[PDB]
Design an enzyme around this catalytic site. Structure first.
Site, PDB file in Angstrom:
ATOM      1  N   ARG A 196       0.797  -1.215   0.000  1.00  0.00           N
ATOM      2  CA  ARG A 196       0.000   0.000   0.000  1.00  0.00           C
ATOM      3  C   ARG A 196       0.836   1.275   0.000  1.00  0.00           C
ATOM      4  O   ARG A 196       1.744   1.412  -0.825  1.00  0.00           O
ATOM      5  CB  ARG A 196      -1.010  -0.071   1.155  1.00  0.00           C
ATOM      6  CG  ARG A 196      -2.037  -1.190   0.939  1.00  0.00           C
ATOM      7  CD  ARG A 196      -2.779  -1.592   2.204  1.00  0.00           C
ATOM      8  NE  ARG A 196      -3.520  -0.483   2.796  1.00  0.00           N
ATOM      9  CZ  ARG A 196      -4.749  -0.105   2.451  1.00  0.00           C
ATOM     10  NH1 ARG A 196      -5.426  -0.736   1.493  1.00  0.00           N
ATOM     11  NH2 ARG A 196      -5.310   0.921   3.077  1.00  0.00           N
TER      12      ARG A 196
ATOM     13  N   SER B 175      16.034  14.248   6.992  1.00  0.00           N
ATOM     14  CA  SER B 175      14.662  14.597   7.355  1.00  0.00           C
ATOM     15  C   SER B 175      13.837  13.383   7.741  1.00  0.00           C
ATOM     16  O   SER B 175      14.200  12.241   7.428  1.00  0.00           O
ATOM     17  CB  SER B 175      13.958  15.410   6.248  1.00  0.00           C
ATOM     18  OG  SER B 175      13.464  14.560   5.230  1.00  0.00           O
TER      19      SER B 175
ATOM     20  N   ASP C 246      -2.870  12.540   9.421  1.00  0.00           N
ATOM     21  CA  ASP C 246      -4.245  12.290   9.015  1.00  0.00           C
ATOM     22  C   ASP C 246      -4.904  13.641   8.769  1.00  0.00           C
ATOM     23  O   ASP C 246      -5.055  14.431   9.692  1.00  0.00           O
ATOM     24  CB  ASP C 246      -4.959  11.500  10.135  1.00  0.00           C
ATOM     25  CG  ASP C 246      -6.411  11.169   9.813  1.00  0.00           C
ATOM     26  OD1 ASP C 246      -6.941  11.609   8.768  1.00  0.00           O
ATOM     27  OD2 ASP C 246      -7.029  10.461  10.633  1.00  0.00           O
TER      28      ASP C 246
ATOM     29  N   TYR D 124      -7.224   5.580  17.954  1.00  0.00           N
ATOM     30  CA  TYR D 124      -6.540   5.871  16.704  1.00  0.00           C
ATOM     31  C   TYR D 124      -6.389   7.383  16.554  1.00  0.00           C
ATOM     32  O   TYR D 124      -5.292   7.880  16.258  1.00  0.00           O
ATOM     33  CB  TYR D 124      -7.313   5.305  15.516  1.00  0.00           C
ATOM     34  CG  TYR D 124      -6.702   5.669  14.178  1.00  0.00           C
ATOM     35  CD1 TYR D 124      -5.550   5.017  13.708  1.00  0.00           C
ATOM     36  CD2 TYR D 124      -7.266   6.675  13.379  1.00  0.00           C
ATOM     37  CE1 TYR D 124      -4.991   5.355  12.491  1.00  0.00           C
ATOM     38  CE2 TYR D 124      -6.701   7.017  12.146  1.00  0.00           C
ATOM     39  CZ  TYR D 124      -5.565   6.351  11.711  1.00  0.00           C
ATOM     40  OH  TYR D 124      -5.005   6.684  10.488  1.00  0.00           O
TER      41      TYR D 124
ATOM     42  N   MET E 269      -6.423   9.706  18.870  1.00  0.00           N
ATOM     43  CA  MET E 269      -5.461  10.214  19.851  1.00  0.00           C
ATOM     44  C   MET E 269      -4.023   9.957  19.385  1.00  0.00           C
ATOM     45  O   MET E 269      -3.158  10.828  19.531  1.00  0.00           O
ATOM     46  CB  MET E 269      -5.677   9.586  21.234  1.00  0.00           C
ATOM     47  CG  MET E 269      -6.982  10.029  21.903  1.00  0.00           C
ATOM     48  SD  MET E 269      -7.526   8.894  23.193  1.00  0.00           S
ATOM     49  CE  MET E 269      -6.237   9.173  24.405  1.00  0.00           C
TER      50      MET E 269
ATOM     51  N   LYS F 206      -2.911   9.647  16.244  1.00  0.00           N
ATOM     52  CA  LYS F 206      -2.580  10.587  15.151  1.00  0.00           C
ATOM     53  C   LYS F 206      -2.441  12.031  15.621  1.00  0.00           C
ATOM     54  O   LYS F 206      -1.612  12.781  15.095  1.00  0.00           O
ATOM     55  CB  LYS F 206      -3.589  10.492  14.004  1.00  0.00           C
ATOM     56  CG  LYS F 206      -3.499   9.175  13.199  1.00  0.00           C
ATOM     57  CD  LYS F 206      -2.094   8.987  12.574  1.00  0.00           C
ATOM     58  CE  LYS F 206      -2.085   7.862  11.544  1.00  0.00           C
ATOM     59  NZ  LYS F 206      -0.696   7.482  11.117  1.00  0.00           N
TER      60      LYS F 206
HETATM   61  N1  LIG Z   1      -5.214   4.828   3.563  1.00  0.00           N
HETATM   62  C1  LIG Z   1      -5.760   5.990   3.923  1.00  0.00           C
HETATM   63  O1  LIG Z   1      -6.904   6.465   3.293  1.00  0.00           O
HETATM   64  C2  LIG Z   1      -5.157   6.818   5.029  1.00  0.00           C
HETATM   65  C3  LIG Z   1      -5.845   7.942   5.532  1.00  0.00           C
HETATM   66  C4  LIG Z   1      -5.285   8.713   6.544  1.00  0.00           C
HETATM   67  C5  LIG Z   1      -4.038   8.371   7.052  1.00  0.00           C
HETATM   68  N2  LIG Z   1      -3.387   7.268   6.555  1.00  0.00           N
HETATM   69  C6  LIG Z   1      -2.081   6.963   7.147  1.00  0.00           C
HETATM   70  O2  LIG Z   1      -1.146   6.750   6.120  1.00  0.00           O
HETATM   71  C7  LIG Z   1      -0.296   5.661   6.455  1.00  0.00           C
HETATM   72  C8  LIG Z   1      -0.394   4.598   5.365  1.00  0.00           C
HETATM   73  O3  LIG Z   1      -1.728   4.143   5.212  1.00  0.00           O
HETATM   74  P1  LIG Z   1      -2.063   2.636   4.739  1.00  0.00           P
HETATM   75  O4  LIG Z   1      -3.514   2.576   4.519  1.00  0.00           O
HETATM   76  O5  LIG Z   1      -1.117   2.219   3.674  1.00  0.00           O
HETATM   77  O6  LIG Z   1      -1.670   1.840   6.082  1.00  0.00           O
HETATM   78  P2  LIG Z   1      -2.094   0.372   6.569  1.00  0.00           P
HETATM   79  O7  LIG Z   1      -2.204  -0.520   5.409  1.00  0.00           O
HETATM   80  O8  LIG Z   1      -3.312   0.420   7.414  1.00  0.00           O
HETATM   81  O9  LIG Z   1      -0.842  -0.031   7.518  1.00  0.00           O
HETATM   82  C9  LIG Z   1       0.443  -0.004   6.958  1.00  0.00           C
HETATM   83  C10 LIG Z   1       1.320  -1.034   7.648  1.00  0.00           C
HETATM   84  O10 LIG Z   1       1.431  -0.739   9.021  1.00  0.00           O
HETATM   85  C11 LIG Z   1       1.996  -1.885   9.611  1.00  0.00           C
HETATM   86  N3  LIG Z   1       1.542  -2.178  10.974  1.00  0.00           N
HETATM   87  C12 LIG Z   1       0.270  -2.311  11.473  1.00  0.00           C
HETATM   88  N4  LIG Z   1       0.369  -2.676  12.780  1.00  0.00           N
HETATM   89  C13 LIG Z   1       1.689  -2.790  13.096  1.00  0.00           C
HETATM   90  C14 LIG Z   1       2.375  -3.149  14.262  1.00  0.00           C
HETATM   91  N5  LIG Z   1       1.737  -3.462  15.389  1.00  0.00           N
HETATM   92  N6  LIG Z   1       3.754  -3.174  14.234  1.00  0.00           N
HETATM   93  C15 LIG Z   1       4.462  -2.863  13.097  1.00  0.00           C
HETATM   94  N7  LIG Z   1       3.786  -2.504  11.946  1.00  0.00           N
HETATM   95  C16 LIG Z   1       2.426  -2.487  11.962  1.00  0.00           C
HETATM   96  C17 LIG Z   1       1.554  -3.093   8.766  1.00  0.00           C
HETATM   97  O11 LIG Z   1       2.684  -3.848   8.353  1.00  0.00           O
HETATM   98  P3  LIG Z   1       2.621  -5.424   7.989  1.00  0.00           P
HETATM   99  O12 LIG Z   1       1.658  -5.569   6.817  1.00  0.00           O
HETATM  100  O13 LIG Z   1       4.034  -5.828   7.615  1.00  0.00           O
HETATM  101  O14 LIG Z   1       2.111  -6.195   9.181  1.00  0.00           O
HETATM  102  C18 LIG Z   1       0.792  -2.457   7.609  1.00  0.00           C
HETATM  103  O15 LIG Z   1       1.021  -3.072   6.358  1.00  0.00           O
HETATM  104  C19 LIG Z   1      -0.731   5.165   7.827  1.00  0.00           C
HETATM  105  O16 LIG Z   1       0.071   5.768   8.818  1.00  0.00           O
HETATM  106  C20 LIG Z   1      -2.160   5.657   7.929  1.00  0.00           C
HETATM  107  O17 LIG Z   1      -2.582   5.885   9.254  1.00  0.00           O
HETATM  108  C21 LIG Z   1      -3.911   6.490   5.555  1.00  0.00           C
HETATM  109  N1  LIG Z   2      -8.663  10.045   7.247  1.00  0.00           N
HETATM  110  C1  LIG Z   2      -9.305   9.222   8.085  1.00  0.00           C
HETATM  111  N2  LIG Z   2      -9.106   9.152   9.404  1.00  0.00           N
HETATM  112  C2  LIG Z   2      -9.928   8.202   9.875  1.00  0.00           C
HETATM  113  C3  LIG Z   2     -10.151   7.719  11.163  1.00  0.00           C
HETATM  114  C4  LIG Z   2     -11.090   6.710  11.368  1.00  0.00           C
HETATM  115  C5  LIG Z   2     -11.815   6.171  10.304  1.00  0.00           C
HETATM  116  C6  LIG Z   2     -11.602   6.660   9.008  1.00  0.00           C
HETATM  117  C7  LIG Z   2     -10.660   7.678   8.807  1.00  0.00           C
HETATM  118  N3  LIG Z   2     -10.232   8.332   7.722  1.00  0.00           N
HETATM  119  C8  LIG Z   2     -10.726   8.139   6.358  1.00  0.00           C
HETATM  120  C9  LIG Z   2     -11.949   9.038   6.098  1.00  0.00           C
HETATM  121  C10 LIG Z   2     -12.533   9.811   7.109  1.00  0.00           C
HETATM  122  C11 LIG Z   2     -13.649  10.615   6.841  1.00  0.00           C
HETATM  123  C12 LIG Z   2     -14.191  10.635   5.562  1.00  0.00           C
HETATM  124 CL1  LIG Z   2     -15.573  11.647   5.243  1.00  0.00          CL
HETATM  125  C13 LIG Z   2     -13.611   9.865   4.555  1.00  0.00           C
HETATM  126 CL2  LIG Z   2     -14.251   9.882   2.947  1.00  0.00          CL
HETATM  127  C14 LIG Z   2     -12.499   9.064   4.817  1.00  0.00           C
END
Ligand SMILES: NC(=O)c1ccc[n+]([C@@H]2O[C@H](COP(=O)([O-])OP(=O)(O)OC[C@H]3O[C@@H](n4cnc5c(N)ncnc54)[C@H](OP(=O)(O)O)[C@@H]3O)[C@@H](O)[C@H]2O)c1
Ligand SMILES: Nc1nc2ccccc2n1Cc1ccc(Cl)c(Cl)c1
Ligand SMILES: NC(=O)c1ccc[n+]([C@@H]2O[C@H](COP(=O)([O-])OP(=O)(O)OC[C@H]3O[C@@H](n4cnc5c(N)ncnc54)[C@H](OP(=O)(O)O)[C@@H]3O)[C@@H](O)[C@H]2O)c1
Ligand SMILES: NC(=O)c1ccc[n+]([C@@H]2O[C@H](COP(=O)([O-])OP(=O)(O)OC[C@H]3O[C@@H](n4cnc5c(N)ncnc54)[C@H](OP(=O)(O)O)[C@@H]3O)[C@@H](O)[C@H]2O)c1
Ligand SMILES: NC(=O)c1ccc[n+]([C@@H]2O[C@H](COP(=O)([O-])OP(=O)(O)OC[C@H]3O[C@@H](n4cnc5c(N)ncnc54)[C@H](OP(=O)(O)O)[C@@H]3O)[C@@H](O)[C@H]2O)c1
Ligand SMILES: Nc1nc2ccccc2n1Cc1ccc(Cl)c(Cl)c1
Ligand SMILES: Nc1nc2ccccc2n1Cc1ccc(Cl)c(Cl)c1
Ligand SMILES: Nc1nc2ccccc2n1Cc1ccc(Cl)c(Cl)c1
Ligand SMILES: Nc1nc2ccccc2n1Cc1ccc(Cl)c(Cl)c1
Lengths: 249, 248, 248, 249
Positions: free
Chosen positions: B12, B135, B141, B154, B156, B158
């Site tokens: 991802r 860096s 988030d 979660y 808290m 972030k």
């Molecule tokens: N996707 C979104 O729409 C979104 C939105 C807001 C913020 N973010 C932030 O952006 C970043 C990337 O998002 P994503 O969706 O690609 O993340 P994700 O798939 O939910 O998690 C990424 C990786 O985190 C690792 N992880 C989970 N628990 C762990 C643990 N206990 N110890 C070590 N590693 C652990 C896992 O590694 P393994 O697979 O190797 O176990 C997982 O593949 C995250 O920090 C997420 O919070 C994403």
């Molecule tokens: N960005 C983000 N932070 C979250 C925390 C808990 C569950 C979902 C989360 N998301 C994705 C998100 C949050 C609000 C909206 Cl309206 C959308 Cl379309 C995606």
């Protein structure tokens, strides 16, 4: 019947001012404390002298651990045991010391700083809600949370986490009519160990009067948020900082 | 060549970040927890391009008594493989609900606050201690101040990460280490999420009514680590297609 | 002797409730109005029936123009002429209507929307300070960072008002004049709006699925001007039932 | 065919550096200026010598007045007249001077400070959108907008309004594929004429390097936001301030 409040870290300073002001407003109060047993008992005695059977103390360490949830549940239980209700929770207790990035272990520092400032407020919020009028929670935040002091990363992380809890819980508990708000001091009562010269250095930074907030001034905002005058307010964090957070470098 | 650590880099968004850094000329440490096969598959692909430019590193980032040692070892792995560590990307993240009203709550605290906040803090410590264009980039988030129902821990974690980003930016400035954030709104949707629910969330995004690709998130990370961002520190760039600006 | 307050746009709705609560708290009031003469006068008559010689009205257009500074100076002057003092200024008057980016000319719209929401508060602040528990309360917008489609000028005016509130708090602190804001989310909905539409907006508010009464907004103003807020300056209190926290 | 950009206040300092970098990236550029005629013409000469017919100047006062909409429409028109398209708008022009609360009249100060910083960007945004690929607008904001300087209320109000415009226009123009973002400097290269003591005073406040940004470092962030690497970014304001905004009193 009189409502009842839990105030954490209530033996002295801002926590005491909050407990006193709630008590003066007609609340029965649980004075939570960790180490300051003499001060806590002394405060309870004063309040009970004013109105019999309206204050109790409750000892607990709010450091994070696998028993912290039980300890937080017990603080809420103590309010119901004493007063048969719990209308208000004030999350005031706080560990505060530097953790530079470059004799406590770092994991103890995490447990203490993040436990007291964030995890305990979270668990107390859970327990308060689970047990449930004008119900509310007030969290003691930090007006300077986005202008961090050097070497205080864990404390700052704890206070940032507390902003998140305040907002998440405001939304999640709104259906139950529990409001969740914050009061954010800038500089109020300075550390006991700080010398006058250094106190003055920090005082002089405050635009409104070049002085720190009195404990009563912080308590005043708490009392507002818990009152009927704030019945539509939830998820708000009120700075009580004399403009300090607006001052540039 | 400079070297980067990316946590949770097997899949991802983390994978896209590792790929883009590698394409930009970095050697990369691909950290993983459970996704060993995917991590090694990625390393294989990057090493096929340029020999001995990618390595993997396993660690649980849950908070515990051993977490500081684990984080020190992740940074150490970069120095061992590559003799330097220029970039740290805190991407790994546990994510699931924790309602206020079979894991115990304290396990959830350890996982959610550990991965999202404490591990980034310890990795930051270890990165700084061991020390050019240095860096750190933290995956934040964009929606952190518009929380989802039932996600307090979660959220808290972030929020704590915002505090860390800003605190470390200030504290590490004297060392010339910049610390910034990239804040997705909606990017890659959870794999367990139904297609109907995915569409619901996609349609909320003003810019194009779609989620960010992993590559689009990676693009902002690449900018932040680049020479084009050498005066930027303590900044958190939303990459959210306007999502955070949309009212109820 | 009783303190005195100026409340702009005080004939109706939120301004009226603020003027009433201020009067109930013991203030003498200047009821400013633009078009609503009858309602302004009926309020003044009501308040004066309660306590003789405690309310007056002041008519003024607060649209931006070359005469706006004189108009704002005259509003403050009216408070001094009536009551010999001016302790509180509430900037409540506000033009509100959409201005899409894609029969009033756009410059008239700029004058009205930016004039009422930002420039007049600025000039009134100047005149208030020049004449000096003193404080100013500005009616802000809790949704100022989650803008509504097609309301850019209104949004710009309210964002400028945040800047004014903060700038004036710092600049006027040496005079002991505090400057704060109250930020509604959804309050008194227009009587003429269809109940089916009102309900659409009401349902968005977490706390009670209802809009704030004018009195609830007024309660926050009362707190901010009171002795219980004497260390509070530069703060903007949301009175929004959690609305600004709700994601798309 | 090369894309085209309008940069307001492009004859000097930050606007000039933005114009130069856009041109180097392959843009044809409208160099707007107010008073700096010689500098604007000299810049246009420099750019046209590199690639013929890729730069023009456009003079305009961006003070608020009843003809401001016509002037803003004409700036956008000048881009289409020269280049047949307008892909990027950079709102950089800005009046800047103190306006204390306690020889220009106050309404002139309002017209200049609010006009240049907020109303002209709004009108230019309107005209840009109306006249319509990787289309975007970049507004020059202020990293210190929430830590105001003493006696600069009108400048601060103008820059705060600009934040509002950036966010409002991002949402409103999203359906048309026009992104709208901001770049927020803290302090950039100080005039050589400013006193050495005062330059040192302001430079020393910056955590990262204890120095101001170069104009080029500010331009770098503008280049990123207009690039294909920022295609999902809209309504974002990137601070380029070396940590300045994070420093407490
Ligand atoms: N996707 C979104 O729409 C979104 C939105 C807001 C913020 N973010 C932030 O952006 C970043 C990337 O998002 P994503 O969706 O690609 O993340 P994700 O798939 O939910 O998690 C990424 C990786 O985190 C690792 N992880 C989970 N628990 C762990 C643990 N206990 N110890 C070590 N590693 C652990 C896992 O590694 P393994 O697979 O190797 O176990 C997982 O593949 C995250 O920090 C997420 O919070 C994403
Ligand atoms: N960005 C983000 N932070 C979250 C925390 C808990 C569950 C979902 C989360 N998301 C994705 C998100 C949050 C609000 C909206 Cl309206 C959308 Cl379309 C995606
Ligand atoms: N004072 C300021 O200028 C300022 C500025 C910004 C924010 N705040 C916040 O406002 C609140 C009140 O400030 P304050 O200065 O009055 O607080 P404080 O004196 O520093 O601490 C309040 C109480 O926290 C309790 N505490 C510390 N560690 C604990 C632990 N491990 N378990 C349980 N309780 C523990 C202590 O109780 P015992 O004494 O019984 O051991 C202490 O009396 C705090 O949340 C603080 O972060 C204050
Ligand atoms: N109601 C809400 O849900 C809400 C939400 C967010 C923010 N706010 C803010 O809260 C405040 C109170 O809200 P509200 O709904 O009660 O306000 P409102 O009814 O929209 O306006 C209040 C008064 O402003 C005056 N006004 C309009 N144009 C004027 C002009 N050109 N010159 C002088 N005065 C003028 C009018 O006075 P006359 O009637 O005498 O002509 C009007 O009665 C406003 O600042 C508003 O922007 C309200
Ligand atoms: N430099 C910093 O440390 C800093 C910090 C925060 C924000 N900013 C913002 O970043 C941008 C660039 O900064 P800068 O220092 O390069 O700007 P600047 O030199 O203060 O102003 C840029 C140009 O604005 C034009 N301008 C002034 N009044 C005008 C008017 N009435 N009509 C049309 N144009 C007018 C001038 O053009 P002419 O010379 O042709 O007359 C001037 O050269 C500005 O928006 C500024 O507010 C800068
Ligand atoms: N509010 C606050 N948060 C802090 C974190 C670590 C150390 C001190 C802290 N304070 C008090 C404080 C912070 C900055 C300033 Cl300029 C002042 Cl007069 C007081
Ligand atoms: N608070 C607010 N600012 C506005 C600007 C333009 C149009 C309506 C505005 N409102 C009221 C409002 C805004 C968003 C929502 Cl979701 C709701 Cl219930 C009410
Ligand atoms: N325009 C302008 N006049 C100045 C006087 C002294 C130092 C810098 C000056 N500038 C450029 C400028 C404009 C706005 C800001 Cl906020 C900054 Cl720091 C610099
Ligand atoms: N960024 C910025 N906005 C300003 C508004 C009025 C005067 C100066 C302004 N600056 C430059 C600035 C502001 C605060 C500090 Cl502590 C520094 Cl060194 C530079």
């Amino acid at each position: 019947e009189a409502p009842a409040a839990v105030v954490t870290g209530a033996a002295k300073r801002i926590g005491r001012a909050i407990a006193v002001k709630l008590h003066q407003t007609g609340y029965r109060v649980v004075i939570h404390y960790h180490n300051s047993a003499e001060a806590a008992v002394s405060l309870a005695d004063e309040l009970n002298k004013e109105r019999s059977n309206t204050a109790v103390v409750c000892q607990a360490d709010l450091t994070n651990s696998n028993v912290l949830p039980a300890s937080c549940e017990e603080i809420i239980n103590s309010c119901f045991r004493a007063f048969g209700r719990c209308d208000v929770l004030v999350n005031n207790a706080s560990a505060f010391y530097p953790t530079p990035l470059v004799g406590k272990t770092v994991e103890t520092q995490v447990a203490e700083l993040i436990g007291t400032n964030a995890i305990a407020p979270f668990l107390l919020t859970m327990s308060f809600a689970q047990r449930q009028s004008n119900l509310s929670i007030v969290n003691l935040c930090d007006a300077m949370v986005d202008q961090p002091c050097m070497a205080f990363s864990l404390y700052n992380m704890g206070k940032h986490a507390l902003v998140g809890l305040t907002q998440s819980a405001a939304l999640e508990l709104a259906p139950y009519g529990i409001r969740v708000n914050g009061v954010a001091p800038g500089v109020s009562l300075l550390p006991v160990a700080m010398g006058e010269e250094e106190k003055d250095k920090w005082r002089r930074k405050v635009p409104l009067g070049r002085r720190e907030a009195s404990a009563e001034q912080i308590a005043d905002a708490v009392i507002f948020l818990v009152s009927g005058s704030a019945q539509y307010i939830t998820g708000s964090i009120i700075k009580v900082d004399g403009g300090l957070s607006l001052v540039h470098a």
